Design a protein around this motif. Sequence first.
Motif, PDB file in Angstrom:
ATOM      1  N   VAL A   1     -34.282 -19.664 -19.277  1.00 54.94           N
ATOM      2  CA  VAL A   1     -33.861 -19.904 -17.769  1.00 54.94           C
ATOM      3  C   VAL A   1     -34.443 -19.137 -16.862  1.00 54.94           C
ATOM      4  N   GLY A   2     -34.980 -17.860 -17.418  1.00 51.30           N
ATOM      5  CA  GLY A   2     -36.060 -16.502 -16.428  1.00 51.30           C
ATOM      6  C   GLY A   2     -37.010 -17.197 -16.464  1.00 51.30           C
ATOM      7  N   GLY A   3     -37.183 -17.661 -17.780  1.00 49.84           N
ATOM      8  CA  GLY A   3     -38.690 -17.947 -18.041  1.00 49.84           C
ATOM      9  C   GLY A   3     -38.685 -19.849 -17.535  1.00 49.84           C
ATOM     10  N   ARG A   4     -37.768 -20.501 -17.045  1.00 51.39           N
ATOM     11  CA  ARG A   4     -37.337 -21.446 -16.974  1.00 51.39           C
ATOM     12  C   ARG A   4     -37.800 -21.473 -15.382  1.00 51.39           C
ATOM     13  N   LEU A   5     -37.531 -19.976 -14.741  1.00 52.79           N
ATOM     14  CA  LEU A   5     -37.652 -19.786 -13.529  1.00 52.79           C
ATOM     15  C   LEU A   5     -38.870 -20.089 -12.997  1.00 52.79           C
ATOM     16  N   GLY A   6     -40.887 -19.507 -13.802  1.00 54.53           N
ATOM     17  CA  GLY A   6     -41.919 -19.370 -13.247  1.00 54.53           C
ATOM     18  C   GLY A   6     -42.246 -21.265 -13.538  1.00 54.53           C
ATOM     19  N   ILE A   7     -41.913 -22.040 -14.329  1.00 53.42           N
ATOM     20  CA  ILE A   7     -42.188 -23.417 -14.732  1.00 53.42           C
ATOM     21  C   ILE A   7     -41.913 -24.039 -12.902  1.00 53.42           C
ATOM     22  N   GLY A   8     -40.349 -24.085 -12.595  1.00 51.89           N
ATOM     23  CA  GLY A   8     -40.152 -24.540 -11.225  1.00 51.89           C
ATOM     24  C   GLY A   8     -41.054 -23.530 -10.121  1.00 51.89           C
ATOM     25  N   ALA A   9     -41.090 -22.461 -10.418  1.00 51.13           N
ATOM     26  CA  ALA A   9     -41.895 -21.224  -8.669  1.00 51.13           C
ATOM     27  C   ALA A   9     -42.907 -22.318  -8.707  1.00 51.13           C
ATOM     28  N   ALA A  10     -43.802 -22.262  -9.620  1.00 47.48           N
ATOM     29  CA  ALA A  10     -45.470 -22.653  -9.941  1.00 47.48           C
ATOM     30  C   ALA A  10     -45.474 -23.998  -9.278  1.00 47.48           C
TER      31      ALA A  10
ATOM     32  N   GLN B   1     -52.994 -25.218  -0.871  1.00 46.41           N
ATOM     33  CA  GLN B   1     -54.427 -26.463  -0.185  1.00 46.41           C
ATOM     34  C   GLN B   1     -55.346 -25.869  -1.110  1.00 46.41           C
ATOM     35  N   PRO B   2     -56.362 -25.987  -1.417  1.00 46.71           N
ATOM     36  CA  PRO B   2     -57.028 -25.334  -2.067  1.00 46.71           C
ATOM     37  C   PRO B   2     -58.442 -25.055  -1.931  1.00 46.71           C
ATOM     38  N   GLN B   3     -58.431 -23.583  -2.118  1.00 45.13           N
ATOM     39  CA  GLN B   3     -59.137 -22.619  -1.883  1.00 45.13           C
ATOM     40  C   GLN B   3     -58.439 -21.851  -0.712  1.00 45.13           C
ATOM     41  N   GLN B   4     -57.380 -21.751  -1.143  1.00 47.51           N
ATOM     42  CA  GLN B   4     -56.717 -20.812   0.091  1.00 47.51           C
ATOM     43  C   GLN B   4     -55.822 -19.305  -0.509  1.00 47.51           C
ATOM     44  N   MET B   5     -55.789 -18.697   0.448  1.00 49.63           N
ATOM     45  CA  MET B   5     -55.127 -17.209  -0.627  1.00 49.63           C
ATOM     46  C   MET B   5     -53.823 -17.013  -0.543  1.00 49.63           C
ATOM     47  N   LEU B   6     -53.312 -16.955  -1.692  1.00 51.33           N
ATOM     48  CA  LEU B   6     -51.986 -16.198  -2.076  1.00 51.33           C
ATOM     49  C   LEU B   6     -51.878 -14.522  -2.601  1.00 51.33           C
ATOM     50  N   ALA B   7     -50.823 -14.350  -1.447  1.00 48.89           N
ATOM     51  CA  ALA B   7     -50.483 -12.945  -2.411  1.00 48.89           C
ATOM     52  C   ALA B   7     -48.889 -13.191  -2.822  1.00 48.89           C
ATOM     53  N   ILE B   8     -49.151 -12.026  -4.076  1.00 51.22           N
ATOM     54  CA  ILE B   8     -48.489 -12.128  -5.318  1.00 51.22           C
ATOM     55  C   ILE B   8     -47.499 -10.872  -5.245  1.00 51.22           C
ATOM     56  N   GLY B   9     -46.502 -11.118  -5.798  1.00 53.07           N
ATOM     57  CA  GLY B   9     -46.048  -9.057  -6.207  1.00 53.07           C
ATOM     58  C   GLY B   9     -45.822  -8.724  -7.587  1.00 53.07           C
ATOM     59  N   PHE B  10     -45.359  -8.382  -7.820  1.00 57.07           N
ATOM     60  CA  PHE B  10     -44.879  -8.379  -9.051  1.00 57.07           C
ATOM     61  C   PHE B  10     -43.389  -7.889  -9.512  1.00 57.07           C
ATOM     62  N   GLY B  11     -43.363  -7.822 -11.174  1.00 52.63           N
ATOM     63  CA  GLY B  11     -42.744  -8.273 -11.979  1.00 52.63           C
ATOM     64  C   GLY B  11     -42.388  -9.605 -12.448  1.00 52.63           C
ATOM     65  N   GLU B  12     -41.709 -10.048 -13.768  1.00 45.94           N
ATOM     66  CA  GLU B  12     -41.566 -10.703 -14.540  1.00 45.94           C
ATOM     67  C   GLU B  12     -41.308 -11.649 -13.880  1.00 45.94           C
ATOM     68  N   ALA B  13     -40.914 -12.095 -12.844  1.00 46.24           N
ATOM     69  CA  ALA B  13     -40.102 -13.410 -12.363  1.00 46.24           C
ATOM     70  C   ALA B  13     -41.357 -14.013 -12.505  1.00 46.24           C
ATOM     71  N   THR B  14     -42.063 -13.206 -10.692  1.00 47.86           N
ATOM     72  CA  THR B  14     -43.711 -13.648 -10.135  1.00 47.86           C
ATOM     73  C   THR B  14     -44.758 -13.800 -11.129  1.00 47.86           C
ATOM     74  N   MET B  15     -44.077 -13.221 -11.844  1.00 47.80           N
ATOM     75  CA  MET B  15     -45.630 -12.744 -13.051  1.00 47.80           C
ATOM     76  C   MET B  15     -46.375 -14.468 -13.840  1.00 47.80           C
ATOM     77  N   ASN B  16     -44.033 -14.147 -14.681  1.00 47.20           N
ATOM     78  CA  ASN B  16     -44.897 -15.816 -15.595  1.00 47.20           C
ATOM     79  C   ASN B  16     -45.483 -16.944 -14.969  1.00 47.20           C
ATOM     80  N   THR B  17     -44.601 -16.936 -13.771  1.00 49.91           N
ATOM     81  CA  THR B  17     -45.214 -17.416 -12.165  1.00 49.91           C
ATOM     82  C   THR B  17     -46.538 -17.985 -12.173  1.00 49.91           C
TER      83      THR B  17
END
Lengths: 306, 308, 308, 307
Positions: free
Chosen positions: A87-96, A104-120
């Motif tokens: 599940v916790g590993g599954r939320l990534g597949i989902g979020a990603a 959209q192609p060549q867009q900027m993506l701000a990222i946070g820290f943490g296992e959740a977003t990291m897996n993503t």
Amino acid sequence: GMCEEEQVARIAWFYYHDGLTQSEISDRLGLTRLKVSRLLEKGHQSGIIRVQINSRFEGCLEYETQLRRQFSLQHVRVIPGLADADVGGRLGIGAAHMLMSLLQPQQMLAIGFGEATMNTLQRLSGFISSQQIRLVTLSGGVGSYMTGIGQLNAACSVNIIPAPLRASSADIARTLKNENCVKDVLLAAQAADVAIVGIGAVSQQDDATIIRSGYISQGEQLMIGRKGAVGDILGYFFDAKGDVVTNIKIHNELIGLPLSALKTIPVRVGVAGGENKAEAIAAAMKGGYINALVTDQDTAAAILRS
Amino acid sequence: EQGMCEEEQVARIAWFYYHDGLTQSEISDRLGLTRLKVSRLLEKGHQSGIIRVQINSRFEGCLEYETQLRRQFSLQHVRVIPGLADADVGGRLGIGAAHMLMSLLQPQQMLAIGFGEATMNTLQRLSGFISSQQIRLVTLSGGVGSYMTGIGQLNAACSVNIIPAPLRASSADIARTLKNENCVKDVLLAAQAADVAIVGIGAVSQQDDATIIRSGYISQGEQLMIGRKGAVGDILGYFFDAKGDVVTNIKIHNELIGLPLSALKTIPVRVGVAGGENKAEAIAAAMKGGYINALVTDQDTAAAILRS
Amino acid sequence: EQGMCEEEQVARIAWFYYHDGLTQSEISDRLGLTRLKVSRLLEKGHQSGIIRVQINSRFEGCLEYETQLRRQFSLQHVRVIPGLADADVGGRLGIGAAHMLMSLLQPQQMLAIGFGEATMNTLQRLSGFISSQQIRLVTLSGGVGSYMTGIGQLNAACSVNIIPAPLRASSADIARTLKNENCVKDVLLAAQAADVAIVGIGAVSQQDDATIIRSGYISQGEQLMIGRKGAVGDILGYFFDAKGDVVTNIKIHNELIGLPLSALKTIPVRVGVAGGENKAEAIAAAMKGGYINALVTDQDTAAAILRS
Amino acid sequence: QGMCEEEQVARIAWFYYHDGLTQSEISDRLGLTRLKVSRLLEKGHQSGIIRVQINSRFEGCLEYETQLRRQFSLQHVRVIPGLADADVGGRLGIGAAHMLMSLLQPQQMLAIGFGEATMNTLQRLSGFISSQQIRLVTLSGGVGSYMTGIGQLNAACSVNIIPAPLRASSADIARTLKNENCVKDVLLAAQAADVAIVGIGAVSQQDDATIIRSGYISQGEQLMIGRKGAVGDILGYFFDAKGDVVTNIKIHNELIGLPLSALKTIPVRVGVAGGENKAEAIAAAMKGGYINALVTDQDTAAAILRS
């Protein structure tokens, strides 16, 4: 051969099950092409032609819509849980997979820290390369991000805040925030098209994904809750009403975008699971920090429930 | 992982070519690949570091320049890659430097790394060895991004301890404070304790036309100022004189978050990788100062050193 | 000679070829040697042992074992997945085996399948391939249900020829009767006619913990007595000795509805998938009998086989 | 891509009916074509992922329905609205299926016979079997004669199949198979199911019936069957107009599979059969008590009550 209710039931059958055409139905009963159409819509409004979904684990679509409107989210996804899959590993597949239908192609993506977003980011390696998405870190930390950008075909733009996540004093922090090379990447982020962050709950005692990280002490956690915080985002704690907690020390010592700035980025994806985060996740939307959520059925339930 | 694995495919067609001895073509009719695709994965294997080309012979390198260099400066190790008509003369240093490290590093050891295309290219050509032997990496200077191009591969499962600080502080005091911020002073120690270190060597000589000042870590006027005070070359940002000693009256030195040269000396095996006939002056000064006790350079540069 | 010794020449050509990555020709116009002169010294380099190529990738030992196994047993095909940190191994055998089958089966070919978790997980990991390629499947043994957890997917549109009988008959004659009951005699031929067949291997050692005893197809004491008779492992329910020959004095053999081991041989590519260090001797014996000419296993088991 | 096949259907199902969008309007949301959408929706209905409850007494033809229910004492009955040909065999499925959806309780066992009748039903009941985790047991051997039904079933449903052919060559070969543990066990499993579904065959439809076309009965065996007083069958067992089985029949002793007397054990026995030339048998089927629930079309229903 008669009755209005019987007609309803007849044409319904012939339409859905037998699968005929509004017209093909006319030439069966003394009714006009138009006559049938009316009794059909009449069927659903009165409630005689009801359509039900039959697929174990679709309750995810029920929760999804409620969440969607009871918090007004641009986007929501609620993966089930099934037989483990972590599940916790599954939320990534989902979020990603959600980010893939947002970015959209060549867009900027701000990222946070943490296992959740990291897996993503891990589950998004491929998409990032192909569409050449530009990444930028929402907070310092440096290493607290490597387990994510570990992949990335070693040819992707990765703007990283060259500073730690939290400074010793609330001053060293202010100093670093105005150090060009840091002041730049902050900008870069505040300018991102989409942002993805995880949500941390305060309930969790020496069991949280921010306490284990040695970013805050055990007693600094307690006092945080005491002051009314119920969860956090990027190191910033807030209350159930979704508003930031003023009397917090750690806020002034964090190198990295503050909550106000985050809101600037249009699509802010939030990925978080665990029945113990429902209160925080909720508060998280009441404050408008995230306008898109991604979570499991259970978590989703607990939210809408209490 | 899904299937096939890009890493295993390379190892597979590597074993199918060299040991079992097959032709680029005959390998195609084995796995779903085109004669061209094969050739590609093989090349990748080489650059990545998955394919090592040991040469069990005294003449691997230019023994002449090599031995002289070895004695005239008392180096633990040295290698002088066979000079060749231009072709950059900078990435080639990588494949040689990389190969030396592969014969120095023992399993699960810690490796201190500096910055620069020299040392960065080396990490690229060292990926495979890093993975398999699970070598630990630690950065000798802040910068973070200034290291991505090297830590780009590394099978996303290698311990990379990076200093959470910028390369140079705006003030020499902001730097003093950052160097005392636990999470920063902690990674410095890690590095200050590594088993082997690899650093490139910068020369004052190659003013401007050097990816040194081009990295915008030093100004046009800062560069000249550097020279005037007797600087000939640098290491991780510290400039020194021809006698190999550091220059005291230099301001940039106190603004650098990152291990100091004196501490670098702790690391038992210090490999220096540098090419360019315009760097001999410096590279030599680097050995006279004892900052490196191992050197990897090309024929030309080597000569250049020995000569004057 | 000219300029230098010949050992030095090989050393230079090698560097320029492998590392610097030149053309056998492009190297000629470097030193006083002809297109073919270089080619000679290169091969000379390999044969003499100066230029030795090593592979560096944690999980290559599997290619080591693969080759030995392939030749010390003469196998048309071999695959040895590592094992790394968990991944179940047993569950990893499937993905490996299935992956192999994809590289063997040709569109619309017939594939004889055996029973057991080994082979069954393989079918699962091959759902996709079977559908697209419209692979035809036939059961090499009765049992029926002991096959559902495999053909469970298979897009509800694939040709599945199943033997309409149980796996083992009560008496050795009720079996003989069913073996010649048209609808069964047909599927047998169907199977003995397949292009590729994949079966797992069972070992005798395993007591009350085997994948054949827990299936309730053989009793506790029926197992001990088969071992006593000299069997070391089985295939499709038929046991054999270490020399790979079938054990004569076995009762169960004549009670099994389904292809005999002799017939299995008919099928050209016989892939065998099995793991576990306790199957080593069985697995081997299984190759000495020629029941399988293609094996799929993990490193550990692979090692254990080669060893003892 | 992403969303597996099943979720894709559930998704465009919910975004069509509840949220209410157009076949086109939904294309512009997921990577699909106007036509591809239409396909996933159709699939949703056929597979059973989409049910269409009709909370009304007139779902079916009440007149024939109620008469049938009383004149035969049936537990449940459904008379799908007849219509201009369109096979008159697949439709039976959608109706039969929907009935089972209202009878089957979570995690219960379902005994099933063979034939296009009951096989279609299985297909139109996939979704229901999955979600509800319904267990399946076969009432007759045959194995392959069931694949076209168990073809779906999300590869995670417990299917207990009899490891024997439907008919043995000798009446003795069958007696021994019936006593082969693994065979004797699945029979009990079935003999204990919570509900059963079987089609009904008619002697009348000689030749022109996918019954003899199944090659489990010869041309001359069919005829001989009739002459001894057989009007129709169930699972391969023929009976007379009085609803009782025909004794002097050979094939009865060569069939591996639950006997009709045991089928009666199963509390809810739904029979599904259409075709105006099957009326005679269908009725014999109830007077014999083999089925206490029936599912058929208007025509067939009439034909029954009439003569």
